[PDB]
């Protein structure tokens, strides 16, 4: 509350470690947790199975009910997003799966969603695997798409890959009594805090930016106590758990999140302007050097431009394909938020059946922590290799 | 194939490591996997997203699509269970969740299941969270319970906690064209191989026995290529993934599985007859004894008694509660298959908030036998029984 | 205290975990450890820097001074070897290095050692890198080789590779007042406990058998409080530390040590007799085999034959090289004590830096027996012998 | 075509990973490594036992001879320090131990060293445990202290704790033919590269800054092929090995080293000036502060002030003791280079040429500048 976000990222979820005479949280691989007696054991099992948080001093009983290393990572992100509690899972898709199953179980299987979403999130809603029905709606048509069966309104900003922004204040107003789930993977709690704009749930693919080194899969939703209990009820019986070492590395990554994001953001802001001058590129999508931020969201909603850039090329698919293959320092791979700069053709990786399929000339670029001159020299060499 | 199961446990899933000049498989924590070009990268993405196994030489693309350390653990168990392929997940419940969602997606949401099952598996079917409908049936009433939209027949033997056995040959005959999923957590591939009896899928909570040290959560289903694709299709979009270090420790544990199981089984067989002589215990349930097994399943289906023992006490809830609390060496905790011997009161912990019929007897006590000496374990259990 | 060695391997070094509500010890990667105040922090720093063990409740201060996971592994082995304390290091050679530097620092740089030793230990003494002087002596000539500045008598039984046994009771009598250091890597605390025969220090290359899965390097010396303090003084300033995850896996491996050792020993006892019948092998060296132990050490010193087998071939170097290269299931690699069976030519790999006079025979081949089936291992070794 | 140091920190030691279809290096825990045949296996064993680097395609044979994850971390730091090769060990003290034993083995047991050094390095030389003799000399008296059997000239800048700087160009000139070992733990390859100034060996306690999260012990010396071969010869038989997961986390930390160091340096530069205005502190030692570097080393030798701050208090031991006990956000613990801010009393923790009792060392982390200021002022006012 009185500490700045930079301090909260370092010391968040590190309570009681200094008193115990330790520097970093220990990795407890224990699958089972012994109990003091039958009465407290049975009470603690039922308490956690029904989605409640662990009481201090009580036994965790089993790893599928509670794990301390995961709980430390959960409290660390909840403080950053200004949320009451948070629930962590194996991947970002496991968190989305639990969020949708919680809505279905509560008798609300219908979901209202904006079309520019992550490929996996879009495919999971379209298939209706978890007993869900979806109505694809635009920012202005959210209120109309709301049914008496809607359990959640799913939004993502900046969108993956185009980086289209969404006004969160208007979305919450349109949803009204329906909770809003905001995928804040790209912005991170450093740039955006949807809970402050009135959102109920905030999803993050911890695999990107929260980990920051491309070596820890994870998913986490910062939300109020009601949805946290519903998500833990699902987690206890579906079991898409985050491994203790995975939780350790994601919590470890949160300490350097503010420093890494600001460094990659500075490089991305400069690269977007330098690449715009190249004749092979027709458009540069970047919230800071924007062609789609007339609403003044950069300042009101986002405290920074981000570290992602989408580039439209003048030869369509052929130029986009050649540019990706001729990169040497920049690695052609899916995923983002890592220490190294990655590149992809979203239409072929993020390809068979879609209405909101991105342009063939579009190329997504995750900016890492390399020098700005070395990254432009490599991207210019790949563009000139046409 | 021409190797004994003891040899297969050690060298299973270790192909190509000796040629690469390494002893154990490396732990690759990589979340993303680079691609050679857009054409091969995109094709590899679509094949793995549609649940296909990774073709040799192709890039894994992303960890939610494929991971090499998990794949090594998958091939190791599949060879032990005599299955074509296997799919691993974060926990045993994640594997069950994916198997049920695979059936629902194929237009078969109905499941026929025999009542004595693990608490979580029973609760997941009863709630119908994953869009499933269930008809609880007995071993003889499986054929009648089969509906036109049945996707699976779920069976578990020895059952958790009572250790009731199920004739798998008769179950497969009753199911007919419906695939049979058999939870083989308690027996492990050392004692039982349901695929040999005609089962289609074999679930294992790798958290117990496969890991063997109580430090690696996991779940895995050894099955034919058809269900392996359906399970991977669900895994790719739901993402209940097994962490590379978790997969490493479960694969590591498989090397010592036959040696650990036989050692714990020996101690369990000795403790079953020693505890039966005590007057405080009315009955000792143990698959290794042919008493409660009139069908001759120990020999045809199971090559050993196991390392789990259920005990019925003469004082009901009060004696069961006191016996658990007075144990010092034996630790009162949930879970099984570890090196440490554990004890639990199912009617007071896992099945306390459960209905009268589905919950076990208030005097029943489950005991997972470990690698401690038989004399030190009986002395501790006798001291706890005499303390009431 | 009144527990069997099998029970002690599972619960050794696991005190207070059940009270804290945890199953296995946590891996604390912390490099630094905060202090309550300047007075207690400074005193605990001085206490640990001077080689003393950590007091309960006091802060570890720094990892180079103390680490809890390593300390758990240390107390677990000390109970098995019947020693007061134990000190762990990065490798078996790091423990040997610290033992020699502790003797040199105490004004005793001379070491009396029996010639059949592991290659690295032999080369480290011959070079005199750590300011050591060595007098190579036989079992009977130990007393004569003792000089006024002797620090310790180094002995290893069964010796690497030949598997020569040494009567430890006679060695302690010959040494008299000088402490005896026994490398018990091959026997392990399951088969031999040199402390009961009067030895002062017991070195184990934890890398083999204690780990048991070929994935954790380590070294440890079970000894009295005086030598434990001297070893910790050297460790605090030289810093050859055992990593917390390495200590976790070696402590994890101790829980299955008795079960794994007995399983490999049974296979080795049968393999040594089956390989003796082959005409290509002239002699099979194994402690538990006729004409290999005239002093009756197998019974009063060793409770088992072990899991290592050395054998001489009738073609010398050419037959030894062909036999190693034609093995498929048995892997040609250095090291031992793992779950898989390994084979080597000691003259070309382990005992290569040793002087030509102390080098083993060219026809000799060392074999570490794993946990595979006895029939599959003999079929592979017979196929390799017949390929020449 | 040459890459900047910021790019080299990210992609250093990552060669062949993109071609193999992997993002980060795998952790190979293997203790032993199988061989193709007796002839190649035996030759590879002798090659690595005599301190040579592993040839591509050859088997590592055993972990005490070679480990791939450690080798990747070694090549990553060598490129940053502009050295030919590097040798990694369990701790910074294990690296110092091997550096001294390599000198003793070469018939040069005498070492010339400057008095302001790390406590452990100072105690290891004074004791003479590894068969070493030491002559303590000042910057100007290095040439005179050089004996016929001198193996190394050990220097550390900024010194631990006082942060006293040493002109490395003059030290190399004074040493002449004797190789110079520089402990570059505090500056890191981001700020200083002693190899460029003519140093032969550069030691780093990887435990600090290279790891950056206080969870990976380590030590590493960036040096030429001759000393690297000698250091690997000692490592192969003494066995103070860096664990594969430890090497993985230290290599992982190098990717964010430039970004973390610059962030902590900015906070330290502001804190040193804000704390100077407080009346309880008599003097604030920081390389970047005015009147603290008359030789112009900031610019020629160091590209930044660093993230460490030592300061003298006006009450001696009592004020220093109270200040560290009243800190709440800043943690009283030994060590440095982590994500969190640590504080210590160098006289009590870590009577041999000791620093002043009023001196307090402070490792600046990645927290906000205002929150650190508020906590330290509250602790000073509590006296
Ligand atoms: C040459 C490399 C292989 C070494 C292997 N045993 C090494 C070994 C050591 C030293 O332990 P570290 O290797 O953990 O330092 C000590 N003592 C014995 C008896 C050994 O056999 C062997 O096959 O003998
Ligand atoms: C399974 C595809 C992975 C795509 C990756 N999560 C991305 O957003 O680029
Ligand atoms: C959440 C309860 C888990 C307990 C464990 N599945 C058991 O069989 O005891
Ligand atoms: C062994 C004490 C560790 C001291 C710590 N390395 C420091 O910088 O003060």
DSSP character string of A85-131: EEEEESSHHHHHHHHHHHHHHTT--EEEE-SS--HHHHHHHHHTTTS
Encode burial over D207-217: b for 16+ CB neighbours within 10 A, e otherwise: bbbbbbbbbbb
List all residues 6 or more positions away from C148 whose beta carbon is below 8 Å from its beta carbon: none
* Nearest-angstrom CA–CA distance, D197 and D168: 6
**Phi, psi at residue A279, to the nearest 5°?**
-75, -25
Q: Is A326 on the interface with D (CB under 8 A)?
A: no
Nearest residue on chain C to D45, judged by CA atoms?
C349
CA B188-B192-B196 angle, to 5 degrees, is: 130
Q: Whose CA is nearest to atom 5 of ligand 2?
A: A335
SS3 state of residue B240: coil
List all residues 6 or more positions away from B367 whose beta carbon is below 8 Å from its beta carbon: B308, B309, B310, B311, B330, B341, B342, B343, B344
* Count helices and strands in chain C by DSSP H and E runs: 14, 12
- Indicate yes or no: CB of D59 within 8 angstroms of CB of B21: yes
CA nearest to D130, candidates D156, D146, D151: D151
Token pair of A76, please? Answer: 């660390």
Residues with CB under 6 A from ligand 2: A 118, 160, 334-336, 350; B 62, 64-65
Q: How far is the CA of A91 from the centre of ligand 2 (A)?
A: 11
In the sheet that holds D85-89, the strands lie side by side as D85-89, D219-223, D201-204, D180-183, D150-156, D110-113, D133-136
SS3 state of residue B342: strand
SS3 state of residue D136: strand
Q: Do the annotations mark residue C64 as ligand-binding?
A: yes
Catalytic pick from C208, C230, C235, C255? C208
The dihedral built from the CA positions of residue D11, D14, D16 and D17, taken in this order, carries a sign that is negative
To the nearest whole angstrom, how far is the Cα of B9 from the nearest Cα of chain C?
8
Resolution of the experimental structure, in angstroms: 2.7
Ligand 1 contact, C97 CB (< 6 A): no
Contacts of A26 in chain C (CB under 8 A): 26-30
Which residues of B define the annotated binding site? 62-64, 92-93, 118, 205-207, 366
Q: Do the annotations mark residue A92 as ligand-binding?
A: yes
CA nearest to B201, candidates B234, B224, B172: B224
Q: Is C256 on the interface with B (CB under 8 A)?
A: yes
Packing angle of the helix pair D225-238, D92-105 (nearest 10 deg) = 110
- Indicate yes or no: CB of D26 within 8 angstroms of CB of B27: yes
* Nearest-angstrom CA–CA distance, A96 and C276: 64
Ligand 1 contact, C120 CB (< 6 A): yes
* Count helices and strands in chain A by DSSP H and E runs: 14, 12
Token pair of C250, please? Answer: 């070696």
* Nearest-angstrom CA–CA distance, D291 and C177: 63
SS3 state of residue D190: helix
Round to the nearest angstrom and report the end-to-end CA distance of chain B. Answer: 53
Cα A64 to the chain's mean position, in Å?
Answer: 23
The CATH class of the A5-28+67-255 domain is alpha beta
Packing angle of the helix pair D244-255, D68-81 (nearest 10 deg) = 30
CA distances from C236 to B132, C193, D98, D143 (A): 61, 28, 15, 32
Ligand 3 contact, A60 CB (< 6 A): no
Ligand 1 contact, C150 CB (< 6 A): no
CATH 3.40.50.1820 is right for the domain spanning B258-386:
no
- Indicate yes or no: CB of D256 within 8 angstroms of CB of A252: no
* Nearest-angstrom CA–CA distance, D234 and A64: 47
C-beta of residue A205 within 8 angstroms of C-beta of residue A185: yes
DSSP C153: E
> Which of A22, A56, A71, A243 has the most C C-beta neighbours within 10 Å, making it the best mutation to test the interface with C?
A22
- As beta bridge partners, residue B367 has B309, B343
Contacts of A33 in chain C (CB under 8 A): 21-23
CATH number of this structure's domain C5-28+67-254: 3.40.640.10
To the nearest whole angstrom, how far is the Cα of C97 from the nearest Cα of chain D?
6
* Nearest-angstrom CA–CA distance, C358 and C355: 6
CA nearest to A156, candidates A201, A124, A102: A201
To the nearest whole angstrom, how far is the Cα of A340 from the nearest Cα of chain D?
6
Ligand 3, pocket-test mutation among A62, A235, A239, most atoms within 8 A of CB = A62
Contacts of B255 in chain C (CB under 8 A): 213, 339-340, 371
Q: Do the annotations mark residue A93 as ligand-binding?
A: yes
C-beta of residue B118 within 8 angstroms of C-beta of residue B107: no
Contacts of A252 in chain D (CB under 8 A): 213, 215
* Nearest-angstrom CA–CA distance, D31 and D64: 8
The count of other CB atoms within 10 Å of the CB of residue C211 is 25
* Nearest-angstrom CA–CA distance, C197 and A208: 59
* SS3 annotation, B75-115: HHHHHHHCCCEEEEECCHHHHHHHHHHHHHHCCCCEEEECC
- As beta bridge partners, residue A365 has A309, A343
The dihedral built from the CA positions of residue D286, D292, D295 and D299, taken in this order, carries a sign that is positive
**Phi, psi at residue C82, to the nearest 5°?**
60, 35
> Which of A28, A40, A57 has the most C C-beta neighbours within 10 Å, making it the best mutation to test the interface with C?
A28
* Nearest-angstrom CA–CA distance, D197 and A242: 48
Packing angle of the helix pair B225-238, A92-105 (nearest 10 deg) = 90
The count of other CB atoms within 10 Å of the CB of residue C147 is 15
Residue corresponding to tokens 């064209």: B177
Encode burial over C189-206: b for 16+ CB neighbours within 10 A, e otherwise: bbbbbbbebebbbbbbbb
Architecture, CATH, for domain D258-381:
Alpha-Beta Complex (3.90)
Q: Is C152 on the interface with D (CB under 8 A)?
A: no
Q: How far is the CA of B350 from the centre of ligand 3 (A)?
A: 7
CA B9-B13-B18 angle, to 5 degrees, is: 105
Round to the nearest angstrom and report the end-to-end CA distance of chain D. Answer: 57
List all residues 6 or more positions away from A116 whose beta carbon is below 8 Å from its beta carbon: A156, A159, A160, A162, A164, A356
Q: Do the annotations mark residue C131 as ligand-binding?
A: no
- Indicate yes or no: CB of A258 within 8 angstroms of CB of D6: no
Encode burial over B7-16: b for 16+ CB neighbours within 10 A, e otherwise: bbbbbbbbee
C-beta of residue B248 within 8 angstroms of C-beta of residue B213: no
Q: How far is the CA of A122 from the centre of ligand 2 (A)?
A: 12
- As beta bridge partners, residue A223 has A85, A201
Token pair of D21, please? Answer: 């279809």
DSSP E strands, chain D: 85-89, 110-113, 133-136, 150-156, 180-183, 201-204, 219-223, 281-285, 308-313, 331-332, 342-344, 359-363
- Indicate yes or no: CB of B239 within 8 angstroms of CB of A93: yes
* Nearest-angstrom CA–CA distance, A132 and A197: 27
Q: How far is the CA of A64 from the centre of ligand 3 (A)?
A: 9
Token pair of D137, please? Answer: 């000399």
**Phi, psi at residue D172, to the nearest 5°?**
-60, -40
Helix (H) or strand (E) holding B274: helix B257-276
- Indicate yes or no: CB of B62 within 8 angstroms of CB of A215: no
DSSP D78: H
* Nearest-angstrom CA–CA distance, B131 and A5: 42
CATH 3.30.1180.20 is right for the domain spanning A258-384:
no
Ligand 1 contact, C242 CB (< 6 A): no
The count of other CB atoms within 10 Å of the CB of residue B386 is 11
**Which ligand does the CA of A91 lie closest to?**
2
CA nearest to D231, candidates D219, D246, D248, D245: D219
CA distances from A142 to A366, B87, C229 (A): 30, 39, 72
The upper half-sphere exposure of residue B222, i.e. CA atoms within 13 Å in the direction of its Cβ, equals 29
**H helical segments located in chain C:** 5-11, 38-49, 68-80, 92-105, 119-127, 142-145, 168-175, 188-191, 225-238, 244-254, 257-276, 297-300, 317-325, 374-386
* Nearest-angstrom CA–CA distance, C22 and B333: 10
User: Experimental method for this entry?
Assistant: X-ray
The number of C-beta contacts closer than 8 angstroms across C and D is: 205
For chain D, domain boundaries: 5-28+67-255, 258-381
Q: Is C349 on the interface with D (CB under 8 A)?
A: yes
DSSP D110: E
Ligand 1 contact, C157 CB (< 6 A): no
CA distances from D333 to C45, C215, D312, D344 (A): 11, 33, 18, 6
* Nearest-angstrom CA–CA distance, A341 and D255: 12
Ligand 2, pocket-test mutation among A94, A120, A348, most atoms within 8 A of CB = A120
- As beta bridge partners, residue A156 has A183
Residue corresponding to tokens 């982590």: D338
């Amino acid at each position: 509350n009185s500490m700045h976000p930079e301090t909260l990222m370092v010391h968040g979820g590190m309570d009681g470690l200094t008193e115990a005479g330790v520097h970093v949280p220990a990795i407890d691989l224990s699958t089972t947790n012994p109990v003091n007696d039958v009465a407290t054991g049975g009470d603690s099992y039922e308490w956690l199975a029904t989605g409640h948080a662990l009481k201090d001093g009580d036994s965790a009983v089993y790893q599928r009910l509670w794990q301390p290393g995961v709980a430390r990572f959960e409290t660390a992100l909840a403080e950053l997003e200004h949320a009451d509690e948070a629930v962590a899972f194996a991947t970002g898709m496991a968190a989305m799966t639990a969020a949708l199953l919680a809505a279905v179980n509560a008798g609300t299987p219908h979901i209202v969603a904006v079309r520019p979403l992550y490929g996996g999130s879009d495919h999971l809603l379209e298939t209706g695997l978890l007993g869900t029905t979806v109505t694809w709606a635009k920012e202005a048509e959210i209120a109309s798409a709301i049914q008496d069966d809607t359990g959640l309104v799913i939004v993502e900003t900046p969108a993956n890959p185009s980086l289209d922004l969404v006004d969160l204040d208007s979305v919450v107003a349109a949803a009204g009594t329906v909770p809003v789930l905001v995928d804040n993977t790209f912005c991170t709690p450093v740039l955006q805090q949807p809970i402050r704009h009135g959102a109920a749930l905030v999803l993050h693919s911890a695999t990107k930016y929260l980990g920051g080194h491309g070596d820890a899969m994870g998913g986490i939703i910062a939300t109020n106590s009601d949805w946290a209990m519903r998500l833990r009820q699902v987690r206890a019986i579906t079991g898409a758990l985050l491994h203790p070492m995975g939780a350790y590395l994601l919590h470890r990554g949160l300490r350097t999140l503010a420093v890494r994001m600001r460094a990659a953001q500075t490089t991305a802001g400069e690269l977007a302007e330098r690449l715009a001058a190249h004749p092979a590129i027709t458009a540069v999508h970047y919230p800071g050097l924007n062609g789609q931020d007339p609403r003044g969201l950069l300042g009101r909603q986002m405290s920074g431009g981000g570290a992602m850039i989408a580039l439209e090329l003048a030869g369509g698919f052929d130029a986009a394909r050649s540019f990706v293959e001729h990169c040497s320092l920049v690695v052609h791979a899916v995923s983002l938020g890592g220490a190294d700069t990655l590149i992809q053709h979203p239409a072929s990786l993020t390809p068979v059946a879609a209405t909101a399929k991105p342009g063939d000339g579009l190329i997504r670029l995750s900016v890492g922590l390399e020098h700005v001159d070395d990254l432009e020299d490599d991207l210019i060499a790949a563009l000139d290799a046409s």
